[PDB]
Design an enzyme around this catalytic site. Structure first.
Site, PDB file in Angstrom:
ATOM      1  N   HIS A  61       0.884  -1.182   0.000  1.00 43.32           N
ATOM      2  CA  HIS A  61       0.000   0.000   0.000  1.00 43.32           C
ATOM      3  C   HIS A  61       0.926   1.239   0.000  1.00 43.32           C
ATOM      4  O   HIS A  61       0.707   2.209  -0.850  1.00 43.32           O
ATOM      5  CB  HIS A  61      -0.941  -0.133   1.121  1.00 43.32           C
ATOM      6  CG  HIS A  61      -1.798  -1.390   1.014  1.00 43.32           C
ATOM      7  ND1 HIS A  61      -2.680  -1.629  -0.009  1.00 43.32           N
ATOM      8  CD2 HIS A  61      -1.863  -2.463   1.835  1.00 43.32           C
ATOM      9  CE1 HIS A  61      -3.324  -2.801   0.183  1.00 43.32           C
ATOM     10  NE2 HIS A  61      -2.808  -3.341   1.307  1.00 43.32           N
ATOM     11  N   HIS A  91       4.667   6.298   7.746  1.00 46.38           N
ATOM     12  CA  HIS A  91       4.455   6.035   6.332  1.00 46.38           C
ATOM     13  C   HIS A  91       3.944   7.328   5.698  1.00 46.38           C
ATOM     14  O   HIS A  91       3.607   8.265   6.396  1.00 46.38           O
ATOM     15  CB  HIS A  91       3.549   4.870   6.071  1.00 46.38           C
ATOM     16  CG  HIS A  91       2.180   5.128   6.622  1.00 46.38           C
ATOM     17  ND1 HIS A  91       1.803   4.784   7.884  1.00 46.38           N
ATOM     18  CD2 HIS A  91       1.115   5.816   6.068  1.00 46.38           C
ATOM     19  CE1 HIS A  91       0.597   5.238   8.116  1.00 46.38           C
ATOM     20  NE2 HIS A  91       0.106   5.867   7.011  1.00 46.38           N
ATOM     21  N   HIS A  93       1.391   8.968   2.300  1.00 48.31           N
ATOM     22  CA  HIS A  93       0.454   8.857   1.196  1.00 48.31           C
ATOM     23  C   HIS A  93       0.841   9.933   0.184  1.00 48.31           C
ATOM     24  O   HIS A  93       1.211  11.031   0.602  1.00 48.31           O
ATOM     25  CB  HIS A  93      -0.995   9.104   1.669  1.00 48.31           C
ATOM     26  CG  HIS A  93      -1.406   8.205   2.781  1.00 48.31           C
ATOM     27  ND1 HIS A  93      -2.108   7.062   2.613  1.00 48.31           N
ATOM     28  CD2 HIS A  93      -1.139   8.277   4.149  1.00 48.31           C
ATOM     29  CE1 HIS A  93      -2.286   6.472   3.820  1.00 48.31           C
ATOM     30  NE2 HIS A  93      -1.676   7.176   4.766  1.00 48.31           N
ATOM     31  N   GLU A 103      -4.129  13.199   2.288  1.00 47.43           N
ATOM     32  CA  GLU A 103      -5.432  12.625   2.734  1.00 47.43           C
ATOM     33  C   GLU A 103      -6.278  13.744   3.353  1.00 47.43           C
ATOM     34  O   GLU A 103      -7.346  14.077   2.847  1.00 47.43           O
ATOM     35  CB  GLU A 103      -5.169  11.475   3.682  1.00 47.43           C
ATOM     36  CG  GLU A 103      -4.450  10.348   3.013  1.00 47.43           C
ATOM     37  CD  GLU A 103      -4.707   9.015   3.597  1.00 47.43           C
ATOM     38  OE1 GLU A 103      -4.455   8.849   4.812  1.00 47.43           O
ATOM     39  OE2 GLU A 103      -5.144   8.113   2.861  1.00 47.43           O
ATOM     40  N   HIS A 116       2.369  10.239   8.012  1.00 42.31           N
ATOM     41  CA  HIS A 116       1.647   9.785   9.204  1.00 42.31           C
ATOM     42  C   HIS A 116       2.637   9.099  10.129  1.00 42.31           C
ATOM     43  O   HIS A 116       3.180   8.046   9.792  1.00 42.31           O
ATOM     44  CB  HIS A 116       0.561   8.800   8.831  1.00 42.31           C
ATOM     45  CG  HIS A 116      -0.580   9.444   8.116  1.00 42.31           C
ATOM     46  ND1 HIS A 116      -1.506   8.780   7.357  1.00 42.31           N
ATOM     47  CD2 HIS A 116      -0.895  10.790   8.075  1.00 42.31           C
ATOM     48  CE1 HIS A 116      -2.349   9.735   6.887  1.00 42.31           C
ATOM     49  NE2 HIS A 116      -2.012  10.891   7.309  1.00 42.31           N
ATOM     50  N   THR A 195      -7.051   5.540   8.053  1.00 38.74           N
ATOM     51  CA  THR A 195      -7.462   5.897   6.702  1.00 38.74           C
ATOM     52  C   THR A 195      -7.340   4.769   5.717  1.00 38.74           C
ATOM     53  O   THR A 195      -7.635   4.978   4.517  1.00 38.74           O
ATOM     54  CB  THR A 195      -6.695   7.111   6.206  1.00 38.74           C
ATOM     55  OG1 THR A 195      -5.333   6.720   6.032  1.00 38.74           O
ATOM     56  CG2 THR A 195      -6.834   8.341   7.108  1.00 38.74           C
ATOM     57  N   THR A 196      -6.889   3.609   6.157  1.00 36.77           N
ATOM     58  CA  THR A 196      -6.901   2.408   5.339  1.00 36.77           C
ATOM     59  C   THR A 196      -7.695   1.358   6.098  1.00 36.77           C
ATOM     60  O   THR A 196      -7.811   1.398   7.315  1.00 36.77           O
ATOM     61  CB  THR A 196      -5.520   1.804   5.063  1.00 36.77           C
ATOM     62  OG1 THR A 196      -4.934   1.446   6.298  1.00 36.77           O
ATOM     63  CG2 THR A 196      -4.599   2.770   4.408  1.00 36.77           C
TER      64      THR A 196
END
Ligand SMILES: NS(=O)(=O)c1c(F)c(F)c(S(=O)(=O)CCO)c(N[C@H]2CCc3ccccc32)c1F
Ligand SMILES: [Zn+2]
Length: 257
Positions: A61, A91, A93, A103, A116, A195-196
């Site tokens: 991801h 991690h 995004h 996000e 994050h 958020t996942t």
């Protein structure tokens, strides 16, 4: 099944994870004018001097930089929090283009990426138990804009070719996450979710107002990663972000202004 596409992206998640349509989902758009200044919010205490990076992993991801979270070595406290939260991993995004990737949004503005830093509340003993609790996690979110390079990011950027594809890992010791923080710790905070998938409603979000700057070359290296495993057809790891979700019955609080 889930991922970031037409067929399995955010708009499909609710079929495997019904809370996707829950009451405190993340991310959200941060309406800066309507965020409530809270004089009683404390400064955030970020104590990362003893952090022990261990490894970096391509989980298919994103990529995760992991820490030893078996003692209070890198912890978040203060701010809107009532306990101590231990750093487990960070991690990002990011987008296919500089104009998207975050996000959270700020007055509908998208940033190129969002960092994050994930922390779990020590009163629950371990991350797996913490995610089952409404105050289990504190995620520190930091926006990335493209401009001058972030020199504290380069060690992450340079290892990425060793973890190109899902399931790859590499030793990643002595990484200092203080190199990823902006000058100011002013923040917004609200109760939300992962958020996942599994999208659990266990997160106190703390989103810093000040973005960091990364170079176009740094974010271009994120976009060379792959969502597929070795020996599968190439799917670039881009646009691994969930769009803003309904705020519903929540107030975003500001530590400033
Ligand atoms: N984007 S986010 O900040 O809201 C975020 C998540 F969205 C999310 F789902 C998880 S997870 O449940 O642990 C994934 C495990 O299967 C984590 N937590 C971390 C710690 C463990 C772990 C393993 C893989 C990926 C993320 C996480 C998370 F930080
Ligand atoms: Zn995340």
């Amino acid at each position: 099944h889930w991922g970031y596409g037409k067929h399995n992206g955010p708009e499909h998640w609710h079929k495997d994870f019904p809370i996707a349509k829950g009451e405190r989902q993340s991310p959200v758009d941060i309406d800066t004018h309507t965020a409530k200044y809270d004089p009683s919010l404390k400064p955030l205490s970020v104590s990362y001097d003893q952090a022990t990076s261990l490894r970096i992993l391509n989980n298919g991801h994103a990529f995760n930089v992991e820490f030893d979270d078996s003692q209070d070595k890198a912890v978040l406290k203060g701010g809107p929090l009532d306990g101590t939260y231990r750093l487990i991993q960070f991690h990002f995004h990011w987008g296919s283009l500089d104009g998207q990737g975050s996000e959270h949004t700020v007055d509908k503005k998208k940033y190129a990426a969002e960092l994050h830093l994930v922390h779990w509340n020590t009163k629950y003993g371990d991350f797996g138990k913490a995610v089952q609790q409404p105050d289990g996690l504190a995620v520190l979110g930091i926006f990335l804009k493209v401009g001058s390079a972030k020199p504290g990011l380069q060690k992450v950027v340079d290892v990425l070719d060793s973890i190109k594809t899902k399931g790859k890992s590499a030793d990643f010791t002595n990484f200092d996450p203080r190199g990823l923080l902006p000058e100011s710790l002013d923040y917004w905070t609200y109760p939300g979710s992962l958020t996942t998938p599994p999208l659990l409603e266990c997160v106190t979000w703390i989103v810093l107002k000040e973005p960091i700057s990364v170079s176009s070359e740094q974010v271009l290296k994120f976009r060379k990663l792959n969502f597929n495993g070795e020996g599968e057809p190439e799917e670039l790891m881009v646009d691994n972000w969930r769009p803003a979700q309904p705020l519903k019955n929540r107030q975003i609080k500001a530590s400033f202004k």
